[PDB]
């Protein structure tokens, strides 16, 4: 049988057994522009959450190096505020001894004057 004939070509359908079944059976720019615009939100959000979680850790350090600074400045408080008491408590205690013992003496210096008196009395 024949289909077509040409210059540098030719074509011809060749039948062998015809069909037993006569009859045979038994895209938008906006929606891409929307579905694409939507995919980028999703990509730009989980990468924004990454930024947030990283900026959260950035405060954890800002908080950690602070603990270290506070820990030391309270240590130097605790120590200086100990010496302040200790030296004074001692200055109190020590001078209060020396003065109590000079009164024991002061009084036992009076006993003498009243004897020099009890001698004069008798005369």
């Amino acid at each position: 049988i024949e289909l077509n004939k040409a210059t540098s070509g030719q074509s011809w359908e060749v039948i062998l057994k015809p069909p037993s079944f006569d009859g045979v059976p038994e895209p938008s720019l906006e929606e891409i522009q929307k579905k694409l615009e939507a995919a980028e939100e999703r990509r730009k959000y989980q990468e924004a959450e990454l930024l947030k979680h990283l900026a959260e850790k950035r405060e954890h350090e800002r908080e950690v190096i602070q603990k270290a600074i506070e820990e030391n400045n309270n240590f130097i408080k605790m120590a200086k505020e100990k010496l302040a008491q200790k030296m004074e408590s001692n200055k109190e205690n020590r001078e209060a001894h020396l003065a109590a013992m000079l009164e024991r003496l002061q009084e036992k210096d009076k006993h003498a004057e009243e004897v020099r008196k009890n001698k004069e009395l008798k005369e």
Binding site: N72, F75, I76, A79, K80, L83
Partner: peptide, 10 residues
């Protein structure tokens, strides 16, 4: 030791 730990911290 007490004074230096104020003066020079930790």
């Amino acid at each position: 030791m007490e004074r230096l730990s104020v003066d020079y911290g930790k």
